[PDB]
Every structure is written in structure tokens, then in C-alpha cells.
């Protein structure tokens, strides 16, 4: 009586501690290569920002008017998104982006800033709504009558809520010193921001910039995070974009950058710019910068695990 094992005519070569190319009866793949070219968002509150930039949701350009108090478990940034309508940029922009991606959305609250002795309705043609407007959450503080001076003002805000408050203000840089005197008056302008963790000063600097949407003017957006019961203080005398509403983080979420469509039919926790990685394999060779709950990225495109015995045919 003869006893033995099974075999097949066509085996699968695998690699071991000893050899490279050992035929086995059966083998399976461990490195994921199949990618779903969509953002699988089944069962998740998703906000596709589209033309609205993530940071704009704090300042409120026209393209972000429907994202001022969004709420989401998954935040998607698009390449066509823009944080600004009037040309400018944020200081520490990427840190604020990373803060807002896992914020779970934002909740705005009026800061209650009243003014006496200046004009508060600065607008521009680049921030277009029904006519010429500005950032929805900001206020462009100017002088009263086309020129004359800006009084040294000190405004204070106390965070009365139990979560840190996101405070964003802006320093205006006109295209010339003559335009700065036209808007706020002559003399050296100074904006001072102080709190418990924060201490910092800012001086405007007019000058000619390349024209973006028309201007040739810029706006520096800055931000701090007030702690509960901590008070922030602004001491300004011109070239100041004042915050009208503060932001509060809703909870928790995840932010991704993608250019593929949203699909509520598939579910996935691993995302990259090209889509969603849905797999049970421990490794993947699709995108090393994938985020979420992903298999570990490896450089090998295939690593066959032997699910069968050694194949020794006749």
C-alpha cells in the first residue's frame, strides 16, 4: 500500500528563506494593487468643498458661503478650491488646514465687536455676490471720509465656551503707501495681538504686487486659538481686517485631497487622491501617502503567500 500527497500540473512559484521560485499547489496575494477610482463615503457625513478652500470656510469668500458652519466625518479638498476672493494668504496655513481637517466641522459665534469713529463696510469687486462684497466672517475696517486718520482702538474678546476658539484677523497691504494713507491715514500703523499663549505684533507694508483678480493688493490672514475663559486683545490703528465671528471645533473627522467622484455605494476607510483602497490584505503598493486605516505601504508590487504544499508533479 502506497500513501502520498496531491499535486497539480501548474503550480505557483513563491519565495522562501532558501529559494526564489518554489512551485506550490496554491498561493494568494498579500500586496494590494486594485484601486477603486472613487471616494467611498457610504455611511459618512461627507463635505465636498469643491471650489471652496478649507481655510476659506473660516473667513468666508463667496465660494464658501455654504460652508461657513459645515459638519462632517470626512472632508474632501479639491484642486479648484480657493481660500480667498481678495488676493492674500494665511500665516501657518498648513497647520490650520490640519486643524480643520480633523475638526468635524465648525460652529461660528458672533464676537460682538462694535465700532465708533470709523467706517466698517469695505468691499471689493473680486468678492462678488449681488454686487461688490467682502469676506462673510470678516469686516474691512476703514476711515470715515476717504482719508483722515484712524483712532488707536483696542478691542477685546473673551472665550466664554468650554472649547478653544479659532480667531482669525487680517492685515491689509495696499498697492502703495498713498493708498494706505487713503484708507487709514499716514503714519506707522501697528496691530498688536495678545492673550495667554499668544503675544505678537504686526506692521503693514504697502507696495506693488502682481495683479491677481485685478489687484495688486494683498491681505495677510493670521490666527490664534483662545483657551476657555482666556481673553484675546487687539490694539490696532489701521490696515486691519477685523473678525466678526469666531469658530469652534465640532468634534472629529478626517480630511483628504482627491480628484475623483464621491460614491455612497462603497464603503472604505483608506483614501488617497486616486480613490479608495478597499482590501483585507496587510500591504498595499498603490499610494505611500494614503491616509485613514490603510494596509502598510510596501515597494514590492507582489508578495505571494503559499496557501498550499510543495508541488512535485510526475
Amino acid at each position: 500500500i502506497c500513501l502520498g500527497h496531491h499535486a497539480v500540473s501548474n503550480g505557483t512559484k513563491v519565495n522562501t528563506l532558501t529559494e526564489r521560485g518554489v512551485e506550490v499547489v496554491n498561493a494568494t496575494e498579500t500586496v494590494e494593487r486594485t484601486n477603486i477610482p472613487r471616494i467611498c463615503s457610504k455611511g459618512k457625513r461627507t463635505v465636498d468643498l469643491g471650489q471652496c478652500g478649507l481655510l476659506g470656510t473660516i473667513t468666508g469668500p463667496p465660494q464658501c458661503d455654504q460652508f461657513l458652519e459645515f459638519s462632517a466625518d470626512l472632508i474632501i479638498e479639491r484642486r479648484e478650491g480657493s481660500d480667498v476672493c481678495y488676493p492674500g494668504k494665511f500665516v501657518n496655513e498648513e497647520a490650520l488646514r490640519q486643524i480643520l481637517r480633523e475638526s468635524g466641522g465648525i460652529d461660528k459665534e458672533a464676537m460682538g465687536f462694535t465700532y465708533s469713529g470709523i467706517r466698517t463696510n469695505g468691499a471689493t469687486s473680486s468678492c462678488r455676490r449681488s454686487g461688490s462684497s467682502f469676506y462673510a466672517e470678516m469686516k474691512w475696517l476703514l476711515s470715515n471720509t476717504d482719508n483722515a486718520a484712524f483712532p488707536q482702538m483696542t478691542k477685546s474678546y473673551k472665550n466664554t465656551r468650554k472649547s478653544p476658539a479659532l480667531i482669525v484677523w487680517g492685515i491689509h497691504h495696499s498697492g502703495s503707501t498713498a493708498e494706505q494713507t487713503k484708507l487709514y491715514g499716514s503714519g506707522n500703523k501697528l496691530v498688536t495681538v495678545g492673550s495667554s499663549n499668544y503675544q505678537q505684533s504686526f506692521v503693514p507694508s504697502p507696495g506693488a504686487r502682481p495683479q491677481v483678480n485685478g489687484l495688486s493688493g494683498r491681505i495677510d490672514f493670521h490666527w490664534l486659538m483662545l483657551n476657555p475663559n482666556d481673553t484675546v486683545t487687539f490694539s490696532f490703528n489701521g490696515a486691519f481686517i477685523a473678525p466678526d465671528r469666531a469658530s469652534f471645533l465640532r468634534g472629529k473627522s478626517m480630511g483628504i485631497q482627491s480628484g475623483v467622484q464621491v460614491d455612497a455605494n462603497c464603503e472604505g476607510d483608506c483614501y488617497h487622491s486616486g480613490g479608495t483602497i478597499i482590501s483585507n490584505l496587510p500591504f498595499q503598493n498603490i499610494d505611500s501617502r494614503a491616509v485613514g486605516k490603510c494596509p502598510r505601504y510596501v515597494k514590492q508590487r507582489s508578495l505571494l503567500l503559499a496557501t498550499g504544499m510543495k508541488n512535485v508533479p510526475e
Binding site: C2, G4, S9, L17, Q257, V312
Partner: protein, 161 residues
């Protein structure tokens, strides 16, 4: 000594192929095949694994971050990628080695089990087969398979031969 495998054994991983005067026979051994299959299944259950660790974005594809912090990030990501590529290759290779050696071990242990069933009534041939010195019929064959063949109620006859 089992110089090759049986491509016609489509019913299981390990089987018997007897040849007495009554006829032919090839029948898989379910309790060893199920053992090796269970162990491979366990390997697949341990390796097919899902992580509950969420990793967030620290780069930016649309607006590149600061060049120095970007080089530190890329440096770290490349290092971790090297580590995980090494771990994947070594894991696959080791698991494959242990799988092959495991199947071979199961085969050998089955062989020595059948050998210990036939105490002096049979002798090893040297190529994975057993020589019976008494024509064992098919009832005796089924008794050999399900481990019920009597080790002494066929002895004397085979010892004479």
C-alpha cells in the same frame, strides 16, 4: 522517497492508493488534509488583518509645504516604507518556509502512523510504500484507513512470509 505527487488525487491533500488482488483504490485522508488546511487557514486569519490605527495627512499635494519640513516628512516616510517592505518580504518568506515544512511534516507523521499500525505484518519498501506479506483484501484496506486493522490477528501468517 515519495519521488513525486499524485495529480489524479483531486479529492484531498493526502490519500491512499492500494493495489491488492481485488482491485484498485485511491481515497483521500480527511483528518490530515483537514489538519494542514486548518493550519493554513489559521495563517491566513492571522495575516489577513485590519488596522484600527488612523493616519492623517501631514503633506499637501495641492500646495507644497515648507521645503525643509517636507524633506523631513519625505525622509521619515521613506524610512518607514523601507521598514515595512523588509517586514513584508521577510514575513512572506518565513511563512512560506514554515508552510512547506509543515505540509511535509504532516505527510511524514501520517507515514509513520500507518507504519506503527502494521507492526511486523509489513515492511518498509524505501519509496513511501509498505509491503504486506499477506494479501490484504478491501475490507482490510478500509480497516487500515480508518485505523482499525488488527495488529496481531494477521501477524503469524505474514511472519511466515
Amino acid at each position: 522517497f515519495i519521488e513525486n505527487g499524485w495529480e489524479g488525487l483531486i479529492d484531498g491533500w493526502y490519500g491512499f492508493r492500494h493495489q491488492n488482488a481485488q482491485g484498485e483504490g485511491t481515497a483521500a485522508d480527511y483528518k490530515s488534509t483537514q489538519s494542514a488546511i486548518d493550519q493554513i487557514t489559521g495563517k491566513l486569519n492571522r495575516l489577513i488583518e485590519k488596522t484600527n490605527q488612523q493616519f492623517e495627512l501631514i503633506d499637501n499635494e495641492f500646495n507644497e509645504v515648507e521645503k525643509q519640513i517636507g524633506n523631513v516628512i519625505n525622509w521619515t516616510r521613506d524610512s518607514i516604507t523601507e521598514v515595512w517592505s523588509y517586514n513584508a518580504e521577510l514575513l512572506v518568506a518565513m511563512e512560506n518556509q514554515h508552510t512547506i515544512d509543515l505540509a511535509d511534516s504532516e505527510m511524514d507523521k501520517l507515514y509513520e502512523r500507518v507504519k506503527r499500525q502494521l507492526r511486523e505484518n509489513a515492511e518498509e519498501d524505501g519509496t513511501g510504500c509498505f509491503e504486506i506479506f499477506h494479501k490484504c483484501d478491501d475490507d482490510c484496506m478500509a480497516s487500515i484507513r480508518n485505523n482499525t486493522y488488527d495488529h496481531s490477528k494477521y501477524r503469524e501468517e505474514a511472519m511466515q512470509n
